[PDB]
Amino acid sequence: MKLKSFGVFGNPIKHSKSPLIHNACFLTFQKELRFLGHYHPILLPLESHIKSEFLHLGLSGANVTLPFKERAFQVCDKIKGIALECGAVNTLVLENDELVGYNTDALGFYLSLKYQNALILGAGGSAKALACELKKQGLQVSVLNRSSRGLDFFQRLGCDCFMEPPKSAFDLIINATSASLHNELPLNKEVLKGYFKEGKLAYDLAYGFLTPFLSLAKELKTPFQDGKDMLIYNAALSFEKFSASQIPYSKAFEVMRSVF
């Protein structure tokens, strides 16, 4: 078998379930793939260059997670698909000597939901892609952050940006900050209680522990969902491209969900 190497760039990265689900599909599909992929977590120094590292490790493909998604977008040779609108890349693919960037977050998230407006907490690559996705769906979208980071992007999108909590009800309250990953809240407890009383879904992109955000929603009887299904969907959409579009995402999905 011809071997191909893949990875996931993150910092931190060791918590990640991506290698598990990706390697399960590489093993299942090597027949139709006609190569065997192996997939590895990569702690990337903040000071490093993604493209250099991608080229240097000889990768055929990779995923990007926090905090590199907007940086991945900058250093690609070409951007394709809905990533052109998100200013972030979660998926990287070597195409005829070009580093090509995709973003599967918008679609993975969308697919993960079984809502008229949304409050998005956070402003990195994740929050951008969800904002993008929810605007397309015709939701009214508000973004709440601590600073003027990525404001320009959210305003060209047509979002309402806030730095102080809007006194307003939202169907969807979405945590796209890095807070849960550090086991803390993304917002003052009582503010967030306010939104949870009024909301129809508290959604956290972090996965596989009961985060402070989800825990508070749970204590209050608000419906809540962590990012495990989004994770499986993104990954399945990533694997589709890693298979240069031979394996549809729905087949990857079935295998990933089950290994997970």
From Swiss-Prot:
NADP(+) binds at residues 122-126, 178, 205, 227. The active site is at residue 69. It catalyses: shikimate + NADP(+) = 3-dehydroshikimate + NADPH + H(+). GO terms for molecular function: NADP binding; shikimate 3-dehydrogenase (NADP+) activity. InterPro entries: Aminoacid_DH-like_N_sf, NAD(P)-bd_dom_sf, Shikimate_DH, Shikimate_DH-bd_N, Shikimate_DH_fam. Homodimer. GO terms for biological process: amino acid biosynthetic process; aromatic amino acid family biosynthetic process; chorismate biosynthetic process; shikimate metabolic process. This is Shikimate dehydrogenase (NADP(+)). GO terms for cellular component: cytosol. Involved in the biosynthesis of the chorismate, which leads to the biosynthesis of aromatic amino acids. Catalyzes the reversible NADPH linked reduction of 3-dehydroshikimate (DHSA) to yield shikimate (SA). Shikimate binds at residues 16-18, 65, 90, 105, 207, 234. It is an enzyme of class 1 (oxidoreductase). Pathway: Metabolic intermediate biosynthesis; chorismate biosynthesis; chorismate from D-erythrose 4-phosphate and phosphoenolpyruvate: step 4/7. It comes from Helicobacter pylori (strain ATCC 700392 / 26695) (Campylobacter pylori). Keywords: Amino-acid biosynthesis, Aromatic amino acid biosynthesis, NADP, Oxidoreductase. It comes from the Bacteria. Pfam families: Shikimate_dh_N (PF08501). Belongs to the shikimate dehydrogenase family. Its EC number is 1.1.1.25.
